[PDB]
Structure 1
Amino acid sequence: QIRSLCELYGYWSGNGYELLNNLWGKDTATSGWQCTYLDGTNNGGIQWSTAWEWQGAPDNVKSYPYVGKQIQRGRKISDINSMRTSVSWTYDRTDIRANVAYDVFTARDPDHPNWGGDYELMIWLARYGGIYPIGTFHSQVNLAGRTWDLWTGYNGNMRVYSFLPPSGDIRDFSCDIKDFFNYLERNHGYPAREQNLIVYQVGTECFTGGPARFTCRDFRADLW
């Protein structure tokens, strides 16, 4: 690896991207740790990985190490035409409580901190070990060439929309996240004209299990 980010909130940035050893829930663990590795910044993308083992509190996320596309504050979702992104990844085992997911926060306050927002949009590419997203099943949705189970609910005051694979995982994926926002704007009253983009990330929420290793063979993200 080029860089080893094994500290709590170990951080790298470059080429318009950032990487964080985001162990935000680790104090709920009874044992374990996690490191995030920058493997490469080849071909306009990021190659990275994270190794971990966690025990305790099986409904509590211990971490969400991520790669993020850096963005300028104050961009209304309605004024973003496209959020084209692709990811290729593997997990070395699936007998773990973990996901792989895109995470996007928006807020009416353009200076909202990066830990949350008024709304959260997740796109899950894996759902291992019997975990659930926030909330309850809403409906099925056709986007990005696939069918999704949309779940909705609240984390505090924040409305969370999670799009899940009905079956299996999706280890090679590409989409335009604006298709997902546009769907929410039309059918869920999502106030895109009032909401500013806060973060634009992909990573893995880790609950329990391991030793496990997530490898992101390639990540790219753009927005116009």
Structure 2
Amino acid sequence: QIRSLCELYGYWSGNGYELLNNLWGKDTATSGWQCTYLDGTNNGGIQWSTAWEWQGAPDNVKSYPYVGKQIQRGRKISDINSMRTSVSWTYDRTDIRANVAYDVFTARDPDHPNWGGDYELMIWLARYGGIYPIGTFHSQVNLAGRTWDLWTGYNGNMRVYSFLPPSGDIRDFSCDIKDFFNYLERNHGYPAREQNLIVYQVGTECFTGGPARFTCRDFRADLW
């Protein structure tokens, strides 16, 4: 690895991307740790991985190490035409409580901190160990060439929309996240004309299990 980010909130940025050893829930663990590795920045993308083991509090996320596309504040979702992204990943085992997911926060306050927002949009590519997203099942949705189970609910005052695979995982994925926002704007009254983009990320939410290793073989993201 080019960089090993094993400290709490160990951080790298470059090429308009960033990487964080984002162990935001680790104090709920009874044992374990996690490191995030920058493996490469080849071909306009990022190659990275994370290794971990956690015990305790099986409904509590311990971490969400992520790669993020850096974005400028003050861009309304309605004024973003496209958020094209692809990811290729593997997990070395699936007998763990964890997901793989895109995470996007938006907020009416363009200076809202990066830990949250008014709204959260997640696109889950894996659902291991019997975990649930925030909220309850809403409806099925056709986007990005797939069918999704949409779940909705609240994390504090933040409304969370999570799009889940009905079965299996999706280890190679590409999409335009604006398709997901446009669907929410049409059918859920999502106020895209007053919501600003805060973060644009992919990573893995880790609850319990391991030793486990997530490998992001390639990540690319753009927006226009």
**TM-score bracket for the superposition, by shorter chain length:** over 0.9
C-alpha displacement at 1:48, in angstroms?
0.1
**CA shift at 1:186, angstroms?**
0.1
1:20: how far off?
A: 0.0
- CA deviations on 1:76-106 (whole Å, 9 max, x unpaired) are 0000000000000000000000000000000
State the secondary structure of the residue aligned to 2:127.
strand
The total of aligned residue pairs comes to: 224
Shift of 1:181: 0.1
Unaligned runs of 5+ in 2: none
- Aligned partners of 2:96 and 2:106: how far apart in 1? 30
1:81 counterpart = 2:88: no
Deviation at 1:61, TM superposition (A): 0.0
CA-CA distance at 1:134 after TM superposition: 0.1
After TM superposition, give the deviation of residue 13 of structure 1 in Å: 0.1
> Per-residue deviation at 1:167?
0.1
TM (norm. structure 2) is 1.00
Deviation at 1:71, TM superposition (A): 0.1
Q: CA separation in 2, counterparts of 1:80 and 1:94?
A: 36
Distance 2:16 2:218 in 1: 15
The answer for the alignment partner of 2:128 in structure 1 is 128
Per-residue deviation, residues 120-147 of structure 1 (Å, max 9, x unmatched): 0000000000000000000000000000
Deviation at 1:31, TM superposition (A): 0.0
Distance (Å, rounded) in 2 between the aligned partners of 1:128 and 1:108: 33
Find the counterpart in structure 2 of residue 107 from structure 1.
107
Aligned partners of 1:187, 1:206: CA distance in 2, in Å? 31
**Separation in 1 of the partners of 2:16 and 2:46?**
10
Q: How far is the alpha carbon of 1:65 from its aligned partner? A: 0.1
In the TM superposition, structure 1's runs of 4+ consecutive aligned residues that sit over 6 Å from their partners are none
Give the corresponding residue for 2:118. Answer: 118
Q: Displacement, 1:175?
A: 0.1
Distance 1:42 1:110 in 2: 32
Distance in 2 (alpha carbons) for counterparts of 1:13 and 1:156: 30
Question: Identity over aligned residues, as a percent?
Answer: 100
- Deviation track 1:41-80 (CA, whole Å, cap 9, x = no partner) reads 0000000000000000000000000000000000000000
Cα distance in 2 between the residues matched to 1:141 and 1:95: 28
Deviation at 1:163, TM superposition (A): 0.0
- 1: CA distance between counterparts of 2:8 and 2:160? 26
* Structure 1, unpaired ranges of 5+: none
Q: CA deviation at 1:168?
A: 0.1
